[PDB]
């Protein structure tokens, strides 16, 4: 069972601690050349403290009897000779003997070894939670809890053992033995408290041998599990997530090139500065990136959590369902392009299945893979945009630069210290950034309702220095880049404009062969944009496309022989 | 500082170690302004050592806005590992020196001898604790020492030995 089993573990675990707790009580209450072995064997225990330990002993004795009947698989020698059974029979059977024999109530029984039986209950209790199989973070903390118990139970057995034998000569209290034990295990050796009796000498010899083997392996395994939770682990909590804002970044492998461009872009805006940026990444913390997250600014903000976006346990760490964004990014400079893009599609589907309400921002390399993540709110194909810049760089001089400076959010304070004329104005004009505000609401475009779009563009640039780009209507969702004189403005038309600073922030400006037009028939990918492109009347053959070998159509070997105008 | 970086949760900021060590040290000094008999009362101000270390880590990492500084990263990280060793000793010296006033009255230097002996696992027993609180402190100080200090030294040696192979600067 899951529920019915766990209660019996806690029942035995609590009873075994209660016997050790009652042992702490009787030591504090009961207190008193040749060695007086009377003080080792005879112990003036109280009747109520005795009677409770016997009732616990009978319960725990019957539990081991009952458990044998359940899991008896041929060999009883297999079960009796184990350590858990031997420690039971050392502790519990003497308490049963004291029921039948009346003079043996004062006789000593080493009940303190129930500490290890309580540890065996905890290991048995903890591993009932691994019926669900996958629980990576809970595995680390609960395993650490057992390593703490081994350290405590080794000390508890040492304290009790040495405190008991020292009754013979040089009578130590329970606390003096705890001081003595933790000193001897630490290998300090003050010699302020010492053993001076034949049995106690031999116990301390054994306790050092057990300590020097076990304890260093316990600490180094404890540190291994503790240090692994720093790199791998980290959970964005419910208390934090419900109250605060929260954003996720799914990625294969972070770098300084990728991260610093994102963090500077994201926290450049005023309203975004309160947000928290969680990371999801299968690979470990890099050496370079650890310095960036250590900085005071990004120490509070950014939370790097290891684990891929595909597994649903790693989504419960980040808690995407609460968060307001889920960035996915394709792995550039990977051995295979198609495999990297196929992974971002699976991440997109893994995110959408878990958290449907999150707006899915995604980046893909190849254009054919756009269709599969067209359901997502915002898509940026690298190949589509990349080659479009280069095409425009042939007609227009430097559109590559033009678009890069608009999308990168900056303000006019770059290269102002430099001595050159061009460089001051270049960095100022680089601060330009696209914005959007309605007509009636905007202080820029108040008295321009009856007038046209073109008329407003001149007077905006003349007075303020803020040129328009396009308009979005109320009904139409589409953006319309530069209407002519036909488009008249309205009360609520979203004007897109270019300015160094946004209007709402910027109060400082106010105070201070023939061809035929048609859509190309064969689109090489599914989700492609159809446009009119000056098509050929006849569909050309594949041979005539090649220059090098002149086929039976127009035999020209080189490109100069064609005689290209322009 | 709370007003500047308040992002929804105040429980997120109050329950941190840097804030708790502040309220343990600074708030009693504010209580002594209003109450006149409590000037002689003890306040454990020595824990400001760790608050000074938290200032140094916060100070040092302001220099990583330039991103790439590989040699400066190693030396300044070593400086923090030296502070942890000193501040652990300083807290130990002050703590044990304070409690031993009750019985067997040690000076500041005798506690420094006592502390660095106990952390090194030598255990002379020339100087010892013989009082109920001081016994319990030394039990805690050994547990903190035996976990932290070996990890501090081996990380210190890692950064020191890495500067030999990787590092080396031809000076001006």
């Amino acid at each position: 069972n899951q529920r019915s089993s766990l209660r019996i573990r806690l029942f035995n675990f609590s009873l075994k601690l209660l016997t050790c707790l009652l042992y702490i009580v009787r030591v504090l209450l009961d207190n008193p050349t040749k060695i007086n072995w009377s003080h080792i064997f005879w112990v003036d225990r109280k009747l109520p403290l005795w009677a409770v330990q016997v009732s616990i002993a009978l319960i725990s004795f019957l539990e081991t009897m009952l458990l044998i009947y359940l899991s008896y698989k041929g060999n009883i020698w297999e079960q009796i000779f184990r350590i858990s059974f031997i420690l039971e029979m050392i502790n519990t059977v003497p308490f049963i003997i004291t029921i039948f024999w009346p003079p043996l109530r004062n006789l000593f029984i080493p009940v303190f070894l129930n500490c290890w039986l309580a540890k065996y209950a905890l290991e048995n209790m903890i591993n009932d939670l691994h019926r669900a199989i996958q629980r990576t973070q809970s595995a680390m903390f609960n395993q650490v809890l057992i390593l703490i118990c081994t350290l405590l139970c080794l000390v508890f057995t040492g304290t009790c053992g040495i405190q008991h034998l020292e009754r013979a000569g040089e009578k130590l209290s329970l606390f003096k033995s705890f001081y003595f034990c933790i000193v001897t295990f630490s290998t300090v050796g003050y010699g302020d408290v010492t053993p001076k009796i034949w049995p106690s000498q031999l116990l301390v010899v054994i306790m050092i041998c057990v300590a020097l083997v076990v304890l260093p392996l316990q600490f180094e395994e404890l540190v291994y599990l503790w240090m692994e939770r720093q790199k791998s682990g980290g959970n964005y909590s419910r208390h934090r997530a419900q109250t605060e804002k929260h954003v996720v970044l799914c990625v294969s492998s972070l770098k300084i090139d990728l991260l610093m461009d994102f963090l500077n872009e994201f926290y450049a805006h005023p309203r975004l500065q309160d947000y928290y940026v969680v990371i999801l990444c299968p690979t470990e913390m890099d050496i370079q990136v650890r310095r960036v997250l250590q900085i005071p600014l990004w120490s509070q903000r950014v939370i790097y959590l290891q684990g891929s976006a595909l597994k649903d346990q790693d989504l419960m760490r980040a808690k995407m369902d609460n968060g307001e964004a889920c960035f996915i990014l394709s792995s550039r400079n990977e051995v295979d392009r198609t495999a990297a893009d196929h992974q971002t599609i699976l991440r997109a589907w893994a995110v959408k299945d878990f958290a449907p309400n999150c707006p899915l921002y995604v980046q893909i390399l190849k254009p054919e893979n756009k269709f599969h993540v067209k359901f997502a709110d915002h898509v940026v194909c690298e190949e589509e945009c990349k080659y479009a810049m280069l095409a425009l760089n042939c007609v227009c001089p430097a559109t590559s630069t033009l678009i890069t400076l608009l999308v990168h959010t900056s303000r006019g304070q770059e290269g102002q210290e430099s001595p050159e004329q061009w460089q001051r104005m270049y960095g100022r004009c680089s601060g330009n950034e696209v914005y959007h505000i309605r007509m009636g609401d905007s202080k820029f475009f108040m008295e321009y309702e009856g007038k046209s779009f073109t008329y407003a563009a001149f007077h905006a640039h003349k007075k303020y220095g803020v040129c328009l780009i396009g308009i979005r209507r109320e009904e139409n969702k589409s953006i319309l880049l530069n209407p002519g004189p036909r488009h008249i403005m309205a009360a609520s038309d979203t004007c897109f404009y270019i300015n160094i600073t946004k209007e709402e922030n910027s109060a400082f400006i106010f105070k201070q062969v023939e061809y035929v037009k048609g859509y190309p028939p064969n689109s090489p990918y599914i989700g492609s944009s159809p446009t009119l492109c000056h098509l050929l009347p006849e569909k050309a053959p594949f041979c005539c496309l090649r220059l090098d070998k002149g086929c039976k159509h127009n035999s020209f070997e080189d490109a100069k022989a064609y005689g290209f105008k322009n | 500082l709370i007003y500047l970086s308040y992002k929804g949760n105040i429980w997120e900021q109050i329950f941190r170690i840097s804030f708790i060590l502040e309220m343990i040290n600074t708030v009693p000094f504010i209580i002594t302004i209003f109450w006149p008999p409590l000037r002689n009362l003890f306040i454990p101000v020595f824990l400001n050592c760790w608050l000074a270390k938290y200032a140094l880590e916060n100070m040092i990492n302001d220099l990583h806005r330039a991103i790439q500084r590989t040699q400066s990263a190693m030396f300044n990280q070593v400086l923090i590992l030296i502070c942890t060793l000193l501040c652990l000793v300083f807290t130990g010296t002050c703590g044990i020196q304070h409690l031993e006033r009750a019985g067997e009255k040690l000076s500041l230097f005798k506690s420094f001898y006592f502390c660095i002996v106990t952390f090194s696992t030598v255990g002379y027993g020339d100087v010892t604790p013989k009082i109920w609180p001081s016994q319990l402190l030394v039990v805690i100080m050994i547990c903190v020492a035996l976990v932290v200090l070996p990890l501090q030294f081996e990380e210190l040696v890692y950064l020191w030995m890495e500067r030999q192979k990787s590092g080396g600067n031809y000076s001006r």
């Binding site: 922030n505 910027s506 400082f508 | 500082l1 500047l4 970086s5």
Partner: peptide
């Protein structure tokens, strides 16, 4: 930057943190 930069909070935030 009137809304973002010029405020009682951000004057102190630029001085301390940023």
């Amino acid at each position: 930057f009137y809304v973002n930069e010029n405020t009682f909070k951000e004057r102190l935030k630029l001085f301390f943190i940023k």
